Amino acid sequence: SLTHRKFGGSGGSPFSGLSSIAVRSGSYLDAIIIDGVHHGGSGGNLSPTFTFGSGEYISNMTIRSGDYIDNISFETNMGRRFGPYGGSGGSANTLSNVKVIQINGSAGDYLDSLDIYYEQY
Template identity: 40%
Template sequence: MKTLLRICLILGALFCFTIGYPTSARASCNGSSVTPSPHYGGGGGKPFTDIATPIQEVSGIKIRSGAEVDAIQICFRGQAMDFCANQHGGNGGTLFEFSLGPGEYISRIDGRSGSRIDRLTFITNTGKMFGPHGGNGGSPFSIPSICLNGIAGRSGNRLDAFQAFSGEAND
């Protein structure tokens, strides 16, 4: 009987871990309706898209940069586990990492682009700034009033193009 009880407890714990319990109350972006920003940069490299599911939220960003943005990687927080999507771009430049705290989300992205993404800066709803990362080439752009839910673009050895996806903030 004790063995059966242990098996039930283990299976119950596995079930709860697999489906996950609701995450703690915090501001996040609702992924049920996602709006894309304009596409910045050029047409080089291969396309990519990383968007949170309705039960995930963005938990951080990793950027490699020097004179340009060499690579970007978005990380997600889920109900059962946290993970980072694939890195898009090359391994040049210096690696910078940015994690979002409870109740925090990326609310604005500023950058510079020409035929590639020259610079990216991420600003949160709490006013924290990640960047600027990259150089001064290209023309400036801004993606304001968002609740970052994912990214897309094109990449080869560098980040060739960038686009943000916004959900609605669950404040």
């Protein structure tokens, strides 16, 4: 079962383990960089890093994909936008009104796949 459980008290301010995203991109996503850790090849161009503020999370995302990840864009609950980055290949899929919790995937020379964990609202 996918779930989650909270341990501890009621104080403090929320934080997320997913703190920043950048990509290398061209016609595809050559790489995704999650909390600074690089996944994929050295092709394409490196995007600026998007760093989530306090209480900020990805709320909407559009991913184009086929055999690889062709393109990513997202918007946060604070209305900030990342991308689009990549090309116009693949087919588009959108997450709307979510809170992204984690981003896993698979990669080689390019970013082959993404496994996005999220809450759907």
